[PDB]
Amino acid sequence: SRRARIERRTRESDIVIELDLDGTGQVAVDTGVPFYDHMLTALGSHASFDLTVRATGDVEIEAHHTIEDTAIALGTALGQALGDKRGIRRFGDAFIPMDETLAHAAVDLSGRPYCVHTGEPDHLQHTTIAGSSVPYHTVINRHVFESLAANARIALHVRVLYGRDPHHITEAQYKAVARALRQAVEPDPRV
Amino acid sequence: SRRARIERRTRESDIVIELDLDGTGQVAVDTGVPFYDHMLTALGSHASFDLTVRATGDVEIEAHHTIEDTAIALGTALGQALGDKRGIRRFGDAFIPMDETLAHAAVDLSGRPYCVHTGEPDHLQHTTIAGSSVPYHTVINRHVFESLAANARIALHVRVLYGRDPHHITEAQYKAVARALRQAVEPDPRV
Amino acid sequence: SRRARIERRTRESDIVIELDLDGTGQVAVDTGVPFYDHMLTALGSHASFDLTVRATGDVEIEAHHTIEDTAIALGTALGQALGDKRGIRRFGDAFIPMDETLAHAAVDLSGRPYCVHTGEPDHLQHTTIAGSSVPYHTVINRHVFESLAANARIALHVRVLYGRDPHHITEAQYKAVARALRQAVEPDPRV
Amino acid sequence: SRRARIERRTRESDIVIELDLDGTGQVAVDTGVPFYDHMLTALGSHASFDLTVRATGDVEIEAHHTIEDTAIALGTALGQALGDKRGIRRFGDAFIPMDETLAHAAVDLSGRPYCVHTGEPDHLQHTTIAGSSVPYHTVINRHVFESLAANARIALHVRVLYGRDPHHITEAQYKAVARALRQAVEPDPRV
Amino acid sequence: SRRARIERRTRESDIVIELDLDGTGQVAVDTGVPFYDHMLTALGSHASFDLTVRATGDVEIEAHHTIEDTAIALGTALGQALGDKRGIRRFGDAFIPMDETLAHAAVDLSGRPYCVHTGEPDHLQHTTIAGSSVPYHTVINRHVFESLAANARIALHVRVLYGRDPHHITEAQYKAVARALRQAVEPDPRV
Amino acid sequence: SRRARIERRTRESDIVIELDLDGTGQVAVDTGVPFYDHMLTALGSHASFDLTVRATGDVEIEAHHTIEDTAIALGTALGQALGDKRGIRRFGDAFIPMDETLAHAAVDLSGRPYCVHTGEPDHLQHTTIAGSSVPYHTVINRHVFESLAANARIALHVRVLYGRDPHHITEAQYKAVARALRQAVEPDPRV
Ligand SMILES: [Mn+2]
Ligand SMILES: [Mn+2]
Ligand SMILES: [Mn+2]
Ligand SMILES: [Mn+2]
Ligand SMILES: [Mn+2]
Ligand SMILES: [Mn+2]
Ligand SMILES: [Mn+2]
Ligand SMILES: [Mn+2]
Ligand SMILES: [Mn+2]
Ligand SMILES: [Mn+2]
Ligand SMILES: [Mn+2]
Ligand SMILES: [Mn+2]
Ligand SMILES: [Mn+2]
Ligand SMILES: [Mn+2]
Ligand SMILES: [Mn+2]
Ligand SMILES: [Mn+2]
Ligand SMILES: [Mn+2]
Ligand SMILES: [Mn+2]
Ligand SMILES: [Mn+2]
Ligand SMILES: [Mn+2]
């Protein structure tokens, strides 16, 4: 059994994560940041995890703290659920084409904690994805991946090969991480 | 069962496509353009499709119309044979080394219809592959991929990482698409 | 005793500042601009001040006037609480690493009123930090530091050595100013 | 059964290779060049081969001859163990993240003998990895891959996408080749 | 009491670390890599730690694994000895002039795990410091700092402002980290 | 007791220095070069030294010889007063903001004799600070610092980060050296 429940309570936020690595994409994410919900829902589903995320934070300031605390907690949940990491595929990668965008992620689940994030166009450093609720600043993409990798204690390399639309660029990256994780997480019948 | 028979009759050409996604590489291609036959035969075989292509067109003008009409028909056949696309791997990619050439393709079979074609050296914009029959102008490579993606309604990203020989560059690309499709087409035991 | 209460009432805003230089980080900031609240709370806490800030302004226009009026009032409070500035360390500086960001501030509390703000990446000239309330335009960072220095009548040099995330860049700067002030404010046992 | 025993005796060196393609990572490598031992041990293990390498050569001159003769012999063993190459996956690739380094390899086991090695930073042309024994000059990395590909008669493309540490860069490449081989070597249930 | 004993046993190495944050510079380091011993001895002494390091590793390959495993273990010891980190100075920085070299380090002991290493001249990417024993490749400097920061879970920013001699550049950096840690580790009489 | 009296009599000048490291800023400087007097008075006061400087030299030629002989003598006095340098902070640095100018100095009192002087704008190579008496050529700034460091036998790194006014640039540097010395000179309760 590869499950983890993480409860993270800070001054900024209140997080509950329930994670099953061997799931069927049963995902419910509620952080108060709907685009982030969309991204983590995509992450959970495409990784074929079962994932519940319940988060309430200081979104009056902005999404940052909640986003970061959630990523930390999710990272911790991933590492805990992984356990000894014996007999797994360990390495995984995936390409995600999304209209004009092509993104890629590669992981080593038993490698030293590390994150390299490259290729993301410069305008995503100051782009806001905004709806009727709390907005999402795409500059946080790197932060999410770094927080995930550091707390799951994995090597995570995320690349944007090319792209234009910030929604496409961001979603393709989350999905790339997701499917890279899904491959690496699988039992390896020869290891 | 994931089969399709497409009959496409235009002023320019006459096309019959029989496609089985779950084949064993039983391929017979006859378009009147032998290098194109070679490319679609490679595509069918490396995708592990069963594929019959019968095409007669206005090759007195040049191969373009026949090539395009065939790609459209084949795309339509791929989309039809795919059906609802439920329970499939959906995403697929493949690297094809061919001597000095390295090509890559990535697909999303349930993504919006889109094609990105990059990295092909500039001389392929005006290169002709010529034998004893109707020649093949490599500038058409992009056209084929665009027609396939638009009519199969899939996201197809084809890259040449590097290469020199136009035959190698072209064949590696068709083979990359082929094996990307083969991976994406597979039943996914977790979806 | 090094305390000051400043009441500043303009057409744009209504400000009350209570400041104790020799505090324990007892801080409550409410300006109607939650990210600014976060920044001044960080400033008060890391400076080891006791600080209460109550501000209501024309946030329907934007945060600018409130932010500026608050910084002016806080500057005035700092200068008043400083008094004759006898027997204090006078000079102070601090480095603040915050993930990828490194910020620095240096102060001369008995120097001529002056502010130099350098190194902040160009995208912060047009970046918005936005939550569920009144947003914060990072272009105002310099304005805050200039208003503080001019009204406290101190020399304040704020540098960003490098950074990417606008939240990190901004917070590291406020914290750098805070800890620079804390050092400079201390009694000097040899002066 | 896909096994090979190669004995290679030249003026420069004395090599014994025992290879099983369908192994469990039972690896013992002893060439007199300990970093090279480390690399071939990583290669054997990550390829899921069973591999024994016993080599004694003119390491008083330097590691080159031994390294090259070993790579030639290992290549020959790989080609011999492959046999007719019927019913195998044929193509294989793998990404290896190693801290700051990302490496990639792609193979065609039934392609013409060819090696392309790109992306390795310029300082590896003159870098030495040195311990208490015979050192390893990283300039030899390309030589190893070229010798392997030429003697196994396979198409091998090795890329460094980025990296800094010569140990990371080198090991990630050997591991990339290893896992590319492992994928390509697998029986293909549809071919 | 702020002490930690860490025993780390991997396939590559065997490490014992005894650390006292509140020491008097009683330091004994023995890793089999004498320049590394010199660096960690400088680190322990200038941080005013009491530190014993006993390490035996695969130095026949090179110093890398031993160096890295030691840095990981030392990082873990630092984090464990830090405990809840309550009432400490938290932030610390130091400049180290060493002949022509000026180095700097800044830390946040309660910040998120992060390392930024900048300014080191390009020739240190391929420089070897060699004596009568196992040599030290200066490219590993960054690796050490990254491993320390990641495992101590601290924010560590190391800069070389300028320098020429690789021994000076390296030692000044270790000493900068040391004295930055010493400052940050101190009890803060106001926190 | 950390005091020194140096009498230096050359053909060019006649110098008497009385120095107390553990002073209260009781400073009297008279060299016949009033801006230099101002600089050494700032140096003595901000270092919290007790310092008397009496110098008469060949100011008819220019200030150079007197300035240099004074710096040599003062350096010698600093080194002599330092003694064995046991139990002192050893390292010290300070930032000095002065209107538009930011200067910095870092010292190692037990390091090898060395001086690095950087960042001073090019116009100070030929700037004269002139009053009603003997003028001061700012090109001499570097000379002063080099003479101080060489004769005190200390490592002294002086940087101008930025600035415009030659008076500000010069004074900020002397003050930076002063406060760097003051920090480094202090007893270290842990060494
Ligand atoms: Mn953050
Ligand atoms: Mn970047
Ligand atoms: Mn690629
Ligand atoms: Mn979407
Ligand atoms: Mn057309
Ligand atoms: Mn183009
Ligand atoms: Mn061909
Ligand atoms: Mn204004
Ligand atoms: Mn500017
Ligand atoms: Mn914050
Ligand atoms: Mn050779
Ligand atoms: Mn080359
Ligand atoms: Mn290794
Ligand atoms: Mn390493
Ligand atoms: Mn760099
Ligand atoms: Mn040394
Ligand atoms: Mn001179
Ligand atoms: Mn110069
Ligand atoms: Mn600086
Ligand atoms: Mn003055």
Short mmCIF file of N, CA and C in Angstrom, two decimals, chain A residues 29-133:
data_model
loop_
_atom_site.label_atom_id
_atom_site.label_comp_id
_atom_site.label_asym_id
_atom_site.label_seq_id
_atom_site.Cartn_x
_atom_site.Cartn_y
_atom_site.Cartn_z
N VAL A 29 -9.64 18.68 -5.76
CA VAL A 29 -8.71 19.71 -5.29
C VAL A 29 -9.46 21.02 -5.03
N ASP A 30 -9.27 21.57 -3.83
CA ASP A 30 -9.91 22.82 -3.42
C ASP A 30 -8.93 23.62 -2.55
N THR A 31 -8.28 24.60 -3.16
CA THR A 31 -7.27 25.42 -2.49
C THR A 31 -7.67 26.89 -2.33
N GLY A 32 -8.78 27.28 -2.95
CA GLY A 32 -9.20 28.68 -2.99
C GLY A 32 -8.59 29.42 -4.17
N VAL A 33 -7.74 28.73 -4.94
CA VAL A 33 -7.11 29.28 -6.14
C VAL A 33 -7.50 28.38 -7.32
N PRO A 34 -8.61 28.70 -8.01
CA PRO A 34 -9.21 27.78 -8.98
C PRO A 34 -8.31 27.34 -10.15
N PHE A 35 -7.45 28.21 -10.67
CA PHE A 35 -6.52 27.75 -11.71
C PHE A 35 -5.51 26.75 -11.15
N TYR A 36 -5.05 26.99 -9.92
CA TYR A 36 -4.18 26.05 -9.23
C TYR A 36 -4.90 24.72 -8.98
N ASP A 37 -6.19 24.80 -8.62
CA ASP A 37 -7.03 23.60 -8.48
C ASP A 37 -7.03 22.81 -9.77
N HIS A 38 -7.21 23.52 -10.88
CA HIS A 38 -7.20 22.95 -12.22
C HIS A 38 -5.90 22.27 -12.54
N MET A 39 -4.79 22.89 -12.15
CA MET A 39 -3.46 22.34 -12.40
C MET A 39 -3.17 21.08 -11.57
N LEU A 40 -3.52 21.11 -10.29
CA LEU A 40 -3.30 19.96 -9.42
C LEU A 40 -4.28 18.82 -9.71
N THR A 41 -5.46 19.16 -10.21
CA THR A 41 -6.43 18.17 -10.67
C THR A 41 -5.89 17.45 -11.91
N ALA A 42 -5.35 18.22 -12.85
CA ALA A 42 -4.65 17.67 -14.01
C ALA A 42 -3.46 16.80 -13.59
N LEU A 43 -2.69 17.28 -12.61
CA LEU A 43 -1.55 16.54 -12.09
C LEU A 43 -1.98 15.19 -11.50
N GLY A 44 -2.98 15.22 -10.63
CA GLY A 44 -3.49 14.00 -10.00
C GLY A 44 -4.05 12.99 -10.99
N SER A 45 -4.88 13.47 -11.91
CA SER A 45 -5.55 12.63 -12.91
C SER A 45 -4.56 11.98 -13.88
N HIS A 46 -3.69 12.80 -14.47
CA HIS A 46 -2.71 12.31 -15.44
C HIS A 46 -1.60 11.47 -14.84
N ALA A 47 -1.40 11.59 -13.53
CA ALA A 47 -0.48 10.71 -12.81
C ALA A 47 -1.16 9.41 -12.41
N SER A 48 -2.47 9.35 -12.61
CA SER A 48 -3.31 8.23 -12.19
C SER A 48 -3.23 8.00 -10.68
N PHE A 49 -3.06 9.10 -9.94
CA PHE A 49 -3.14 9.08 -8.48
C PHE A 49 -4.60 9.16 -8.06
N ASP A 50 -4.88 8.78 -6.82
CA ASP A 50 -6.08 9.24 -6.14
C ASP A 50 -5.62 10.35 -5.21
N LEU A 51 -6.21 11.53 -5.37
CA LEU A 51 -5.72 12.70 -4.66
C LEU A 51 -6.83 13.63 -4.19
N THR A 52 -6.83 13.90 -2.89
CA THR A 52 -7.70 14.91 -2.31
C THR A 52 -6.84 16.01 -1.70
N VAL A 53 -7.13 17.25 -2.07
CA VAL A 53 -6.41 18.41 -1.56
C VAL A 53 -7.42 19.39 -1.01
N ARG A 54 -7.30 19.69 0.28
CA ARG A 54 -8.14 20.68 0.94
C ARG A 54 -7.21 21.73 1.54
N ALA A 55 -7.32 22.96 1.05
CA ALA A 55 -6.44 24.03 1.50
C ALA A 55 -7.16 25.37 1.65
N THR A 56 -6.94 26.01 2.80
CA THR A 56 -7.44 27.36 3.06
C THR A 56 -6.27 28.21 3.55
N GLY A 57 -6.02 29.31 2.85
CA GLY A 57 -4.89 30.17 3.18
C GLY A 57 -5.16 31.65 3.01
N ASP A 58 -4.10 32.45 3.15
CA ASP A 58 -4.20 33.91 3.14
C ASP A 58 -4.28 34.49 1.72
N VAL A 59 -5.30 34.05 0.98
CA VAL A 59 -5.49 34.47 -0.42
C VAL A 59 -5.85 35.95 -0.59
N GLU A 60 -6.11 36.63 0.53
CA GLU A 60 -6.29 38.09 0.51
C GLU A 60 -4.99 38.80 0.14
N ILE A 61 -3.86 38.22 0.55
CA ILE A 61 -2.53 38.72 0.20
C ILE A 61 -2.26 38.39 -1.26
N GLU A 62 -2.38 37.10 -1.58
CA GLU A 62 -2.33 36.53 -2.93
C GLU A 62 -2.25 35.01 -2.79
N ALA A 63 -2.15 34.31 -3.92
CA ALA A 63 -2.16 32.85 -3.91
C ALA A 63 -0.85 32.20 -3.44
N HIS A 64 0.25 32.95 -3.50
CA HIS A 64 1.61 32.44 -3.25
C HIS A 64 1.75 31.49 -2.08
N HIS A 65 1.43 31.96 -0.87
CA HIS A 65 1.61 31.14 0.34
C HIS A 65 0.84 29.86 0.29
N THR A 66 -0.43 29.94 -0.11
CA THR A 66 -1.29 28.75 -0.25
C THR A 66 -0.71 27.80 -1.28
N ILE A 67 -0.34 28.34 -2.45
CA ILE A 67 0.24 27.53 -3.52
C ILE A 67 1.49 26.80 -3.04
N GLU A 68 2.39 27.54 -2.38
CA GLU A 68 3.65 27.00 -1.89
C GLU A 68 3.44 25.95 -0.79
N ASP A 69 2.62 26.29 0.21
CA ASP A 69 2.32 25.36 1.30
C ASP A 69 1.68 24.07 0.81
N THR A 70 0.79 24.19 -0.18
CA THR A 70 0.17 23.04 -0.82
C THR A 70 1.21 22.17 -1.54
N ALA A 71 2.09 22.81 -2.30
CA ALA A 71 3.15 22.09 -3.03
C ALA A 71 4.11 21.37 -2.09
N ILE A 72 4.47 22.03 -0.99
CA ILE A 72 5.30 21.44 0.06
C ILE A 72 4.63 20.19 0.64
N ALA A 73 3.37 20.35 1.04
CA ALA A 73 2.58 19.26 1.63
C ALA A 73 2.42 18.09 0.65
N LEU A 74 2.10 18.42 -0.60
CA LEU A 74 1.96 17.41 -1.66
C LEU A 74 3.27 16.68 -1.92
N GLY A 75 4.37 17.43 -1.95
CA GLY A 75 5.71 16.85 -2.07
C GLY A 75 5.98 15.86 -0.95
N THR A 76 5.74 16.30 0.29
CA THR A 76 5.90 15.45 1.48
C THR A 76 5.05 14.18 1.38
N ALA A 77 3.81 14.32 0.92
CA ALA A 77 2.90 13.19 0.72
C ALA A 77 3.44 12.21 -0.32
N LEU A 78 3.99 12.75 -1.41
CA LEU A 78 4.58 11.92 -2.47
C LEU A 78 5.76 11.11 -1.96
N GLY A 79 6.66 11.77 -1.23
CA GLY A 79 7.83 11.11 -0.64
C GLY A 79 7.45 10.04 0.37
N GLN A 80 6.48 10.34 1.23
CA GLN A 80 6.00 9.40 2.24
C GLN A 80 5.32 8.18 1.61
N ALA A 81 4.48 8.41 0.60
CA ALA A 81 3.77 7.34 -0.10
C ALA A 81 4.72 6.44 -0.89
N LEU A 82 5.81 7.03 -1.39
CA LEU A 82 6.85 6.30 -2.11
C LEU A 82 7.54 5.24 -1.25
N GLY A 83 7.70 5.53 0.04
CA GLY A 83 8.33 4.61 0.99
C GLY A 83 9.79 4.34 0.67
N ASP A 84 10.16 3.06 0.65
CA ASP A 84 11.55 2.66 0.36
C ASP A 84 11.91 2.75 -1.12
N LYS A 85 10.89 2.89 -1.97
CA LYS A 85 11.04 3.02 -3.43
C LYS A 85 11.67 1.80 -4.10
N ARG A 86 11.46 0.63 -3.50
CA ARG A 86 12.04 -0.61 -4.00
C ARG A 86 11.16 -1.23 -5.08
N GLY A 87 11.79 -1.70 -6.14
CA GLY A 87 11.10 -2.41 -7.22
C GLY A 87 10.30 -1.53 -8.16
N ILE A 88 10.50 -0.22 -8.08
CA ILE A 88 9.79 0.72 -8.96
C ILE A 88 10.63 1.09 -10.18
N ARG A 89 9.96 1.61 -11.21
CA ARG A 89 10.60 2.01 -12.46
C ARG A 89 11.64 3.11 -12.23
N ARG A 90 11.43 3.90 -11.17
CA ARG A 90 12.37 4.94 -10.70
C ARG A 90 12.50 6.15 -11.63
N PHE A 91 12.81 5.89 -12.89
CA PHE A 91 12.92 6.94 -13.90
C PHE A 91 11.63 7.01 -14.70
N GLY A 92 11.27 8.23 -15.09
CA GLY A 92 10.08 8.45 -15.90
C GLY A 92 10.16 9.79 -16.60
N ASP A 93 9.59 9.86 -17.80
CA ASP A 93 9.51 11.11 -18.53
C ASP A 93 8.28 11.11 -19.43
N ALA A 94 7.85 12.30 -19.83
CA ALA A 94 6.70 12.45 -20.71
C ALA A 94 6.72 13.76 -21.47
N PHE A 95 6.34 13.69 -22.75
CA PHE A 95 6.10 14.87 -23.56
C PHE A 95 4.61 15.18 -23.57
N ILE A 96 4.27 16.46 -23.42
CA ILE A 96 2.88 16.90 -23.50
C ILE A 96 2.72 17.98 -24.56
N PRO A 97 2.17 17.61 -25.73
CA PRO A 97 1.77 18.61 -26.70
C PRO A 97 0.41 19.18 -26.33
N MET A 98 0.31 20.51 -26.35
CA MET A 98 -0.94 21.19 -26.08
C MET A 98 -1.08 22.37 -27.03
N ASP A 99 -1.80 22.14 -28.12
CA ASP A 99 -1.87 23.09 -29.23
C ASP A 99 -0.44 23.45 -29.65
N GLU A 100 -0.09 24.73 -29.57
CA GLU A 100 1.23 25.21 -30.00
C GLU A 100 2.36 24.84 -29.03
N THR A 101 1.99 24.45 -27.81
CA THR A 101 2.96 24.17 -26.75
C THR A 101 3.45 22.72 -26.77
N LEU A 102 4.75 22.55 -26.56
CA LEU A 102 5.31 21.25 -26.23
C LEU A 102 6.11 21.38 -24.93
N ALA A 103 5.71 20.61 -23.93
CA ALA A 103 6.41 20.56 -22.65
C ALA A 103 6.94 19.16 -22.38
N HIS A 104 7.94 19.08 -21.51
CA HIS A 104 8.54 17.81 -21.15
C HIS A 104 8.95 17.82 -19.70
N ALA A 105 8.84 16.66 -19.07
CA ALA A 105 9.38 16.47 -17.73
C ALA A 105 10.08 15.13 -17.64
N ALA A 106 11.16 15.10 -16.85
CA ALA A 106 11.89 13.87 -16.58
C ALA A 106 12.14 13.80 -15.08
N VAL A 107 11.98 12.61 -14.52
CA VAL A 107 12.19 12.41 -13.08
C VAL A 107 13.14 11.26 -12.77
N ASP A 108 13.85 11.41 -11.65
CA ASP A 108 14.52 10.30 -10.98
C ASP A 108 14.00 10.31 -9.54
N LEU A 109 13.16 9.33 -9.22
CA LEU A 109 12.53 9.26 -7.90
C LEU A 109 13.49 8.86 -6.78
N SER A 110 14.59 8.21 -7.15
CA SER A 110 15.61 7.82 -6.18
C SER A 110 16.87 8.68 -6.27
N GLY A 111 16.82 9.71 -7.11
CA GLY A 111 17.92 10.67 -7.23
C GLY A 111 17.89 11.67 -6.09
N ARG A 112 18.97 12.43 -5.95
CA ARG A 112 19.05 13.49 -4.95
C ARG A 112 18.00 14.57 -5.24
N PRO A 113 17.42 15.18 -4.19
CA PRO A 113 16.46 16.27 -4.38
C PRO A 113 17.03 17.41 -5.23
N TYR A 114 16.39 17.66 -6.38
CA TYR A 114 16.86 18.68 -7.32
C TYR A 114 15.76 19.05 -8.30
N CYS A 115 15.75 20.31 -8.71
CA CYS A 115 14.80 20.78 -9.71
C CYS A 115 15.47 21.70 -10.71
N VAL A 116 15.32 21.38 -11.99
CA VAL A 116 15.75 22.28 -13.06
C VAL A 116 14.54 22.60 -13.94
N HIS A 117 14.28 23.89 -14.09
CA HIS A 117 13.13 24.37 -14.84
C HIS A 117 13.61 25.31 -15.91
N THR A 118 13.46 24.90 -17.17
CA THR A 118 13.99 25.68 -18.30
C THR A 118 13.00 25.83 -19.45
N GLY A 119 13.24 26.84 -20.29
CA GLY A 119 12.54 27.00 -21.56
C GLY A 119 11.25 27.79 -21.51
N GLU A 120 10.75 28.06 -20.31
CA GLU A 120 9.53 28.84 -20.16
C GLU A 120 9.74 30.26 -20.67
N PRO A 121 8.91 30.71 -21.64
CA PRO A 121 9.02 32.06 -22.21
C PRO A 121 9.00 33.15 -21.14
N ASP A 122 9.72 34.24 -21.41
CA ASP A 122 9.95 35.31 -20.43
C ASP A 122 8.69 36.00 -19.92
N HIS A 123 7.63 36.02 -20.72
CA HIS A 123 6.41 36.73 -20.33
C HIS A 123 5.63 36.03 -19.24
N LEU A 124 5.96 34.76 -18.99
CA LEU A 124 5.35 34.02 -17.88
C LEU A 124 5.91 34.41 -16.52
N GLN A 125 6.99 35.18 -16.52
CA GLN A 125 7.53 35.78 -15.29
C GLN A 125 6.62 36.86 -14.71
N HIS A 126 5.71 37.38 -15.54
CA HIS A 126 4.81 38.46 -15.12
C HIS A 126 3.41 38.32 -15.65
N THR A 127 3.04 37.10 -16.03
CA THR A 127 1.70 36.82 -16.53
C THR A 127 0.75 36.44 -15.38
N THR A 128 -0.48 36.94 -15.47
CA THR A 128 -1.53 36.57 -14.54
C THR A 128 -2.65 35.86 -15.29
N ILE A 129 -3.04 34.70 -14.77
CA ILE A 129 -4.21 33.99 -15.26
C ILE A 129 -5.34 34.30 -14.29
N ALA A 130 -6.32 35.06 -14.77
CA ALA A 130 -7.34 35.64 -13.90
C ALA A 130 -8.76 35.28 -14.32
N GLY A 131 -9.55 34.83 -13.35
CA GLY A 131 -10.97 34.57 -13.54
C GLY A 131 -11.79 35.39 -12.56
N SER A 132 -12.90 34.81 -12.10
CA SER A 132 -13.82 35.51 -11.20
C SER A 132 -13.41 35.39 -9.73
N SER A 133 -12.31 34.69 -9.47
CA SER A 133 -11.86 34.42 -8.11
C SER A 133 -10.42 34.91 -7.88
#
